[PDB]
Amino acid sequence: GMPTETFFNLPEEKRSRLIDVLLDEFAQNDYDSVSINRITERAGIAKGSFYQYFADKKDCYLYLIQLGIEQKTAFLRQTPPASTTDMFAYLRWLLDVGIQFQFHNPRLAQIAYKALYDDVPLPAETMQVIRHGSFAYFKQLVEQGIADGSLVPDLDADTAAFVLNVVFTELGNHLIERFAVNPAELLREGGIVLLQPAMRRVIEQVIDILERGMRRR
């Protein structure tokens, strides 16, 4: 179901304060561990008033997942595109974009990341895009690269897509783990941008490994 018109007709200051609380709750806790009373208490609203904005917990989770999808697509289109024809130069740009979206929207990214592993109630079409969307795109890129003779001829597209998908999914979390001292405050204050010089040489190192491993000799 969709969020109620009561939720959408809320004053911007009240609705933004509620979304901030919903993002924290769904990113810091597993779907089954999410507390509706903790939401109303932190949002500073009446007890039992959550159901005046969302029919159930499922509808609220779907809204947050769709918010992450729409935000990522809008971020992807607002980013200056790559001026290249090389697959690996494009992959470096796409890896950089994915990491930048995570650093600017950590709670939305964390909710979308947990959906890959946790038992969450998402429709078949939404679940497919979340868990198999990026893999399918990498497989298409690898199949294109083998066809134009740039990649190793005997390369298995499915296997190469698996390696690209796991790296792209986990790099951002590893960068934070390696370089960010107190990530909570660093992401909130926006100081994560000061670690880009150290993070970029890792992004370049990652692409170099994938390039040597996949590109034709």
* Least spacing, CB of residue 110 vs Cl ion, in Å: 8
Residue 57 β-bridge partners: none
Give the burial class of 215: count Cβ atoms within 10 A of its Cβ; 0-12 exposed, 13-18 middle, 19 or more buried: middle
Nearest to 71 by CA among 114, 109, 99: 109
Least distance to Cl ion, CB of residue 68, Å: 8
Query: What's the min distance (Å) between Cβ of 31 and Cl ion?
Result: 17
Q: In the complex, what is the shortest distance from the CB of residue 111 to Cl ion, in angstroms, rounded to a whole number?
A: 8
DSSP 8-state assignment for residue 31: G
How many angstroms separate the CA atoms of 108 and 121, rounded?
A: 17
Min. distance of Cβ 196 from Cl ion in angstroms?
19
CB 141 within 8 A of CB 95: no
What three-state secondary structure class fits 125?
helix
Piece in contact with Cl ion (CB under 5 A), picked from 41-49, 54-62, 98-106, 154-162: 98-106
Only one of the segments 92-100, 102-110, 125-133, 208-216 lies at the binding site for Cl ion (rule: CB under 5 A); that segment is 102-110
d(CA 57, CA 38) in angstroms, rounded, equals 13
Smaller CB separation from Cl ion, 98 or 145: 98
Nearest CB to Cl ion, comparing residues 79 and 150: 79
CB-based closest residue to Cl ion:
107
Closest CB to Cl ion among residues 71, 150: 71
Query: Does the protein bind Cl ion through residue 115 (CB under 5 A)?
Result: no
Residue 108 as a binder of Cl ion (CB under 5 A): the answer is: yes
Q: Would you say 105 or 134 has its CB closer to Cl ion? A: 105
H or E element at residue 32:
none
| 8 A C-beta contact, residue 187 and residue 103 | yes
Q: Among 108-116, 120-128, 194-202, 204-212, which window interacts with Cl ion (CB under 5 A)?
A: 108-116
The count of residues in the chain is 217
The answer to whether residue 21 forms part of the interface with Cl ion (CB under 5 A) is no
Q: Which of 57, 72, 92, 107 binds Cl ion (CB under 5 A)?
A: 107
Q: Does 165 bind Cl ion (CB under 5 A)?
A: no
Least Cα distance to 90 among 140, 132, 129 occurs for: 140
Does residue 102 touch Cl ion according to CB under 5 A? no
SS (HEC) of 142-196: HHHHHHCCCECCCCCHHHHHHHHHHHHHHHHHHHHHHHCCCHHHHHHHCHHHHHH
Residues within the interface to Cl ion (CB under 5 A): 105, 107-108
